[PDB]
Amino acid sequence: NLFQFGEMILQKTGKEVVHSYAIYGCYCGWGGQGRAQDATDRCCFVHDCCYGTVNDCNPKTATYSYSFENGDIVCGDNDLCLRTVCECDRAAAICLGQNVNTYDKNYEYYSISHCTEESEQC
Amino acid sequence: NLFQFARMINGKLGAFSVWNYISYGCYCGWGGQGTPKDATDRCCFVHDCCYGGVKGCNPKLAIYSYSFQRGNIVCGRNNGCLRTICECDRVAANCFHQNKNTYNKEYKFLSSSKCRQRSEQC
């Protein structure tokens, strides 16, 4: 669920999701249209499409099993769906961490006046 | 998509209102476990269940058709799952508006520790 995805994100990026990625770009925040603005934003679009592949459980509320081990994120579930959501969240947190170096505060609340162009497609 | 849901919120409650729902309660925004804390929270829980009932598509990325008519949100001519998704958002935005008098600031930004109940069932 999103509380767990928010934990993964803090652990991997140093950032509290609710004050940062949650309002960011055209995809990380309340978006889902226009062009991905940068690498962080693209990671989020990738994670949207990932969620897109999830049919049998709700990725927003499915509570999965994970831990951090040596800097890695380990998804521990059996139920294939729980695990598939966990792996979505893991990859995106790993991707966010890989691109925090170009986090740009100027993309915070960008969807109010932008994201109006061709959208990304999965 | 969330860009549209955010405008439905803003159009019903006022400019910038969407940002009040980024993280509130156990369900609104970056959360998704335990007992809803209040009516506003339950609005979000219902919307999560409404999105979880959507099969064959991806509400985060869906673009549907809607407008405001006399102050009120109206879902346009949406076919198949688009109709379902627009309606999920319509209901939830209207729910937020109707409960804005119980919105309580102290519920913004809960950590998952406050939401460790077995999650309400859809």
Q: State how far the Cα of B61 lies from the Cα of B48, in Å rounded to an integer.
A: 15
Residue A19 annotated to the active site: no
Helices (H), B1-122: 2-13, 39-52, 81-98
Tokens of A66: 């994970």
Q: Nearest-CA neighbor of A33 among B105, B61, B32? A: B61
> How far is the C-alpha of B108 from the C-alpha of A43, rounded, in Å?
26
Give the residue ranges of DSSP H helices in chain A: 2-13, 39-52, 80-98
A63 touches chain B (CB under 8 A): yes
With an 8 Å Cβ cutoff, are A18 and B22 in contact?
Answer: yes
CATH class of B1-122: mainly alpha
Would the annotation count A25 as a binding residue? no
| Residue B68 main-chain phi, psi, to 5 deg | -105, 140
Contact indicator for B81, B56 with CB cutoff of 8 Å: yes
Query: Which sign, positive or negative, has the C-alpha torsion A60, A63, A64, A65?
Result: positive
Q: What angle do CA A115, A51, B87 make, to 5 degrees?
A: 65
All residues at 6 or more sequence positions from A36 whose CB lies less than 8 Å from its CB, including other chains: A25, A26, A27, A42, A44, A45, A120
Test B3 with A33 for CB contact under 8 angstroms. Answer: yes
User: What does the DSSP assignment read for B11-36?
Assistant: HHH-TTGGGGGSEETTTEES---S--
Residue positions of B annotated with a catalytic role? 47, 89
Nearest Cβ partner of B58 from A5, A31, A48?
A48
- Among A3, A33, A58, whose Cβ lies nearest the Cβ of B31? A3
A77 annotated ligand-binding residue: no
Using alpha carbons, list the distances in angstroms from residue B9 to A61, B34, B96: 22, 24, 8
B93 contacts in chain A (CB < 8 Å): none
Task: For residue B61, list chain A residues with Cβ-Cβ distance below 8 A.
Answer: 32-33, 48-49, 52, 119, 122
Determine the Cα–Cα distance for residues B29 and A2; give it in Å rounded to an integer: 8
Nearest of B96, B85, B21, B93 to residue B51 by alpha carbon:
B85
Domains in chain A and their CATH numbers? 1-122 (1.20.90.10)
Does residue A72 sit in helix, strand or coil? strand
Residue B85 has, within 13 A of its CA and on its CB side, a CA count of 22
State the nearest Cα–Cα gap between B76 and chain A, in angstroms. Answer: 19
- Look at B3 and A55 and tell me if their CB atoms are within 8 Å: no
Residue type, B45: F
A48 annotated among ligand-binding-site residues: yes
Distances (CA, A) of B4 to A31, A61, A80, B11: 8, 22, 32, 10
A68: part of which helix (H) or strand (E)?
strand A66-69
Contact B12, B95 (CB under 8 A): no
A chain contacts of residue B48, beta-carbon cutoff 8 Å: 58, 60-61
Which one-letter amino acid corresponds to residue A67? S
Give me the count of residues in chain B: 122
Is the CB of residue B46 less than 8 Å from the CB of residue B91? yes
| A77 included as an active-site residue | no
| Domains of chain B, residue spans | 1-122
Which DSSP category does B79 fall into?
Answer: -
